């Protein structure tokens, strides 16, 4: 397990996925006054982002997940009393305490027997949420699980920082998991390297402020905002993720060309292109929606499913690989069959 823990589940399936994005659409024009048009043009070419959605002050990740959840439950026809666990994966919770999972439990009318867990993960979070939820179902702790995976990273961006300002958008998602009777297996790999903490971090805002003054890379940066060392993240990613993809493919037992899609965290288009090439993946089978939504952090994979795979999922079972990487450092994969599904949708606030 030198390159991550290998995990297998059976007896659980994805039953539906809904994404909810802010109705506020922010075009690149927005940024030309503060940043030079030429510089904006060159950066957005590389990152691939034409538009993104930004939450207003009264809209949180929890709110986006609640609205997605309402739509998902209505579509599935699942009664609130039937939900056994809700896991909220986010870096932008409502409160320091209580956890936002409790707010969602109450707002969705879930029962007292519904487990409520907030877990702090970023870009690597979706495959981990899938694994945890499917493990709960396999082990008989649950029959129906909701995964509320969302973020409003726009609220942590320094508006004077060009790289982060142009990159991030906001989204919230809800994924339904249910007990399944087939013999189909899901495979996951989950890895961590906390030595990367200082390369993707919000220095101030928690209970042990990072020593930003002592870090030359942070000169002129706001400590309450997101810091990213792009060069370090690129090198981390280009090394760890192709190995993750290879090993995931090997343990899932299916030929590369029999996958319907390889769903990557939408880090930036330059990175996505480099990863697909290094992993020898066919570019047409690597969906991208960063152009319309920006990088939506932990929401990026489920948002990709709803915006890019809705029509294909209606009709067939898809063989999917999912690869998340980022903050922690952390990286994670899922490889499994999904669908057909009728409840796959993208709504706005
Ligand atoms: Cl451009």
Numbering used by the authors: 6 to 35, 39 to 284, 286 to 358
Text lifted from the article:
Here we report a functional and structural genomics effort that applied saturation-level transposon mutagenesis and next generation sequencing (Tn-seq) to identify essential genes in B. thailandensis, followed by high-throughput structure determination. We used an “ortholog rescue” approach to maximize structural coverage of these gene families, which are likely to be essential not only in B. thailandensis, but also in related, but more virulent, Burkholderia species, such as B. pseudomallei. Using only seven Burkholderia species to select orthologs of essential genes, we solved structures for 49/406 essential gene families, and for 56 total Burkholderia protein targets (including seven ortholog replicates). Of these 56 targets, 25 satisfied criteria for being a potential antimicrobial drug target.
By using an ortholog rescue strategy for insoluble or difficult to crystallize targets, we increased our structural coverage of B. thailandensis essential genes from 31/406 (7.6%) to 49/406 (12.1%). Ortholog structures may also be useful in designing broad-spectrum antibiotics with cross-species activity, and by representing a variety of functionally conservative point mutations in the active site may be useful in developing drugs less susceptible to mutations that cause drug resistance.
